[PDB]
Every structure is written in structure tokens, then in C-alpha cells.
């Protein structure tokens, strides 16, 4: 291959792909955010956000390939 930077996928996928700790933390953050904002406001949009983010990331990562 001529892609001089090709080897970087091992750690980029490791750290930033769907299964990485960083991605999992972002999803976790929504569960917590949903809980506290709903508690505070009772606005149902805060609960739907969880399903939305999980769906978004799932599609995004599939398309990105990571």
C-alpha cells in the first residue's frame, strides 16, 4: 500500500471505534443526563435522547467503518 499512515487504524479503532471505552462513556453519559434532566424538568425529550444517541452511534460507526 501507499498509505503511509495506514498502521494508525490499530489504535484509532481501539480507542475511538464503536466498542471503545470512549464511545461507551459517551453513551453512559446520556443515561445519566437523561435521568437528571428528566428529574429536573419532566420533559420527555430527555428520555428519548437515549434511544436516539444509541441509534445514531450505531449507524454512524457502521458507516465510518469503526
Ligand X SMILES: CCCCCCCCCCCCCCCC(=O)OC[C@H](COP(=O)(O)OC[C@@H](O)CO)OC(=O)CCCCCCCCCCCCCCC
Q: By the criterion CB under 8 A, which residues form the site for a copy of itself?
A: 1-17, 20-36, 38-40, 42, 44-66
Q: How far is the CB of 43 from a copy of itself (least distance, A)?
A: 10
34 in Cβ contact with 49 (< 8 Å): yes
Q: Is 10 in the site for ligand X (CB under 6 A)?
A: no
Q: How far is the CB of 55 from ligand X (least distance, A)?
A: 4
Q: Is 2 in the site for ligand X (CB under 6 A)?
A: no
Residue 37 CB burial class (10 angstroms; 0-12, 13-18, ≥19): middle
Amino acid at each position: 500500500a501507499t498509505d503511509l499512515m495506514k498502521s494508525g487504524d490499530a489504535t484509532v479503532k481501539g480507542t475511538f471505534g464503536k466498542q471503545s471505552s470512549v464511545v461507551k462513556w459517551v453513551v453512559l453519559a446520556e443515561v445519566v443526563a437523561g435521568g437528571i434532566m428528566y428529574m429536573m424538568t419532566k420533559n420527555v425529550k430527555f428520555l428519548f435522547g437515549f434511544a436516539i444517541i444509541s441509534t445514531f452511534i450505531t449507524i454512524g460507526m457502521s458507516v465510518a467503518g469503526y
